[PDB]
């Protein structure tokens, strides 16, 4: 949705972003690709120029991935067929601790 | 694990904490009122006392209640029976986006 929030980055390889249904964790390197490989057409290029799994990236750097995110054609999977993201819906964290959602 | 990294809130509600295995979930209320209930033994104390959902909670006492969960005779469900966190294993999220974990 385009309400969202995200949450930080895990093991400098994920971001952490959720709307109201579900919690993203979207695979830096593949959304870097995925986005380079929209702009270029070039699957090797857009792979050696975007983030890597592992590099720190800024809280403005990875707010500006997510904002793009939104608008590719395939916000799904890289060019390689990866899935840029694994999901769990929320109310599968509320009602495990007994809260409603 | 006793080496774990902690990622930040959610909801201004759960406690997001990893360590090498999984990723945990942990109710900031839930986990509170379980530190209070083990030193005062009321759990009606324990509550009132205690950090509600949608309180924002600072890096440090965060990292207090996390370092002091560990500790707990009962880190697993509050007095009440509510379960204190959700957890996923890491392997989860790496294997859907086809990373090697």
Redesign the interface.
């Known amino acids: 949705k385009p309400t969202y929030?995200i949450?930080?980055?895990?093991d400098e390889?994920?971001i952490?972003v959720?709307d109201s249904e579900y919690?993203y964790?979207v695979?830096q390197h593949?959304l870097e690709e995925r986005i380079n490989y929209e702009k270029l057409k070039d699957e090797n290029l857009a792979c050696r120029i975007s983030v890597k799994?592992g590099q720190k990236l800024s809280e403005e750097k990875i707010r500006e991935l997510i904002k793009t995110w939104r608008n590719l054609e395939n916000p799904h999977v890289c060019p390689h067929g990866?899935?840029?993201?694994?999901k769990?819906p929320l109310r599968?964290?509320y009602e495990?601790?007994?809260?409603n959602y």
Chains 1, 2 share one sequence.
């Open positions: 929030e949450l930080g980055q895990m390889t994920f952490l959720k919690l964790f695979d593949l799994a990866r899935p840029i993201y694994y769990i599968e964290i495990k601790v007994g809260r």
